[PDB]
Amino acid sequence: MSIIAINENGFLDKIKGRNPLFTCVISSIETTLSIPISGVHRDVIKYTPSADVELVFYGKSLTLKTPPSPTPATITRACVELKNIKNLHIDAGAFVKPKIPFIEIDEKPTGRIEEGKAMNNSKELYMKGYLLGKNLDAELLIVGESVPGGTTTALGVLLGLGYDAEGKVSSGSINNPHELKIKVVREGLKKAGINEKSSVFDVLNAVGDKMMPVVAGLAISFAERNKPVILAGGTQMSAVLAVIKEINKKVLDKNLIAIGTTEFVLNDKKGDLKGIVEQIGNVPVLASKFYFEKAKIEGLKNYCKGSVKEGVGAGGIAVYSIVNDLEPTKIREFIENKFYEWY
Amino acid sequence: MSIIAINENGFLDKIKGRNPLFTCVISSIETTLSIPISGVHRDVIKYTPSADVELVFYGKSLTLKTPPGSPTPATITRACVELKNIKNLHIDAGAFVKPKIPFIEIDEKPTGRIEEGKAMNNSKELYMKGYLLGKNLDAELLIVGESVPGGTTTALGVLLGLGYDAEGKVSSGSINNPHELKIKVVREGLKKAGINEKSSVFDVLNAVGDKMMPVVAGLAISFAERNKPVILAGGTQMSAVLAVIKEINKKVLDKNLIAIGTTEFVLNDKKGDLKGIVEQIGNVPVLASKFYFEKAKIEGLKNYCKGSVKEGVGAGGIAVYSIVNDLEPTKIREFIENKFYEWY
Numbered sequence A: 001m002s003i004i005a006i007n008e009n010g011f012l013d014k015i016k017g018r019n020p021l022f023t024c025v026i027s028s029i030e031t032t033l034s035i036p037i038s039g040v041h042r043d044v045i046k047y048t049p050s051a052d053v054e055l056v057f058y059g060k061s062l063t064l065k066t067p068p069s070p071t072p073a074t075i076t077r078a079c080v081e082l083k084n085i086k087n088l089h090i091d092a093g094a095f096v097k098p099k100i101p102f103i104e105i106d107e108k109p110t111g112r113i114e115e116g117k118a119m120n121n122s123k124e125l126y127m128k129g130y131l132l133g134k135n136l137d138a139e140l141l142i143v144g145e146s147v148p149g150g151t152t153t154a155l156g157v158l159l160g161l162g163y164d165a166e167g168k169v170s171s172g173s174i175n176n177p178h179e180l181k182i183k184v185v186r187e188g189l190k191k192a193g194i195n196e197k198s199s200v201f202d203v204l205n206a207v208g209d210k211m212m213p214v215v216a217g218l219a220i221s222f223a224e225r226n227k228p229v230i231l232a233g234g235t236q237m238s239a240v241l242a243v244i245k246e247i248n249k250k251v252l253d254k255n256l257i258a259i260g261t262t263e264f265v266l267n268d269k270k271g272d273l274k275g276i277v278e279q280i281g282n283v284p285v286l287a288s289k290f291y292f293e294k295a296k297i298e299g300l301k302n303y304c305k306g307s308v309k310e311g312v313g314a315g316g317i318a319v320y321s322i323v324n325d326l327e328p329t330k331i332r333e334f335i336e337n338k339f340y341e342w343y
Numbered sequence B: 001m002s003i004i005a006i007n008e009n010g011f012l013d014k015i016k017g018r019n020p021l022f023t024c025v026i027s028s029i030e031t032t033l034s035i036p037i038s039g040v041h042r043d044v045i046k047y048t049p050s051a052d053v054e055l056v057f058y059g060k061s062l063t064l065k066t067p068p069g070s071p072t073p074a075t076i077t078r079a080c081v082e083l084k085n086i087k088n089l090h091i092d093a094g095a096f097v098k099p100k101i102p103f104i105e106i107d108e109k110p111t112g113r114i115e116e117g118k119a120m121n122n123s124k125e126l127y128m129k130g131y132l133l134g135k136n137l138d139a140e141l142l143i144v145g146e147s148v149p150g151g152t153t154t155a156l157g158v159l160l161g162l163g164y165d166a167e168g169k170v171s172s173g174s175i176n177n178p179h180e181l182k183i184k185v186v187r188e189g190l191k192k193a194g195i196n197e198k199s200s201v202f203d204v205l206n207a208v209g210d211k212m213m214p215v216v217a218g219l220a221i222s223f224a225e226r227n228k229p230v231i232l233a234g235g236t237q238m239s240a241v242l243a244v245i246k247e248i249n250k251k252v253l254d255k256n257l258i259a260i261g262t263t264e265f266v267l268n269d270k271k272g273d274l275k276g277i278v279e280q281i282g283n284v285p286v287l288a289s290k291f292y293f294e295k296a297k298i299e300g301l302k303n304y305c306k307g308s309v310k311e312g313v314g315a316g317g318i319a320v321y322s323i324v325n326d327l328e329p330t331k332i333r334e335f336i337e338n339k340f341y342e343w344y
Ligand SMILES: Cc1cc2ncn([C@H]3O[C@H](COP(=O)(O)O)[C@@H](O)[C@H]3O)c2cc1C
Pocket: A037, A038, A039, A040, A041, A048, A052, A068, A069, A070, A071, A072, A073, A145, A146, A147, A148, A149, A150, A151, A152, A170, A171, A172, A173, A307, A308, A310, A311, A312, A313
């Protein structure tokens, strides 16, 4: 098969033939404007998350001339079309808003991580995600993210919750500035005073990003109804998985929540995803194989060398798509064919 | 029993059992900040739509200290979501003040000045967005309402611009129904915009429509294309929407999946003629919910029997679904009296 399943625990059977809703949660981080923590090029980073979800929902970016080595939203759009997957998208603080219809949970971007001032309202954000979740329906929730800099806020949250994660976080590019990232989050974990006294929300408030409580609410509201949730992302979704255990360890016991990502994230050298998960729980981690070795866009080959890797729920929706008899090469063909248009 | 049906045509069974999505589309009109076309108090008109959908989704209003002079019909909508656990997501298409609850933002800019013929310039694009959003919503039945202060005026202008006999037929928010101020406004606007019979539905919407109209059109046509039923939960405003649905896609109408769902207070409004608008449009089920509000225990609710508020926020349409699916009508009225002091 083209699906690496670690701690599968029956899950892939849970999502076979089930009707999905896909949703991507986007956010922007103040720090990224002046500190190069993110692998998203600075000329497009204010526009990248919205252009991502526009490409998924509508088939064309509008906030940019082209989409953002192409954006992983290319893979997410591939699966949306190739398997006709309904998708709605959520804003929790992107600098520039989507010109497609979208759900507005929070207009204000994630603040400056290095100051312990990520956000003053992570619990409110959590409740909005759960309430929003209560009013969505499907047999399965595939929930992704588009947060430039999200691997840095993922580091702080994991660390702030007492996990061992240095060097373990991934990145949206080949280079992975782990030292800058550690320096950034440590400064704000300290300015905000996070210790082992602190709640999950104290930590999110210091160094998290606003996508995280929202996706936490969504996931728990869906798992509580014994509906499976595919946390579609890499490193970042292990921070959310962690946050979900600090919020309701009970539902996590239910076995209804799996991380779904790409081969390029599972098999990433400059990080260690399964190591972080291990410290959290016996949770299914599922990577999807895309065979971009045999590609015809050298932008797509570049995924095999650490360019991009993941994002916009690409890996987890591919997992879903592939479990439901999608030929994994179609993804590569789709992007291949649509490429000249988009760019 | 508790449901009056014009040309029911079997629609009632098509909706029994099926599980619904309720969505309210809100908007605001610049014209209501200067001209008294609307029955909403001027002091809270800028803040009403947002507060209405707050009440319905979250159980209480946040932009105002209390829900929106009589009591807003969101209480009716609110009541029904809790009693039949109707899932609900709400849509903004130009309200002055955005809601504090999670909402789908389609257009932040309000509806323009009706009298100048400058309601909007993106009606076709708003319809394409409502349609594409429809595609990505899943339910067995869509119940789509609205909350647009001044919306009976834009409904009149749209109906008149499309060649209908609609004067004196639109209903109103409060007991008073300034029909001729309404007519001067939209006729002024139609003239400035140059609408005549060669104009398109979108030219008309851009002259004197409101932005919720084409969004609801898109939502309704997408669900009905997929053979799902659709309740347009509104009064005369939804007859304007119904007219719009017919210009855009006549044949979907002919699939008998789209009905209007309103209150008894609208269908029995002598200061209006909902029935008469719709028979010029086509043979479409018109369904109204009986509330038995004279047995009411708060005069504000009771005030409905005399023409205050009447309808709004999918209240009539959401009740039709909640009654067709075996909810006892009085539970609505006894719900709103139990919490009247919490809200107020
Ligand atoms: C062009 C491009 C578009 C993307 N959209 C999402 N991601 C992905 O990379 C980001 C996280 O990595 P970091 O911590 O380096 O910001 C997220 O936005 C994730 O969705 C992208 C990555 C790239 C290169």
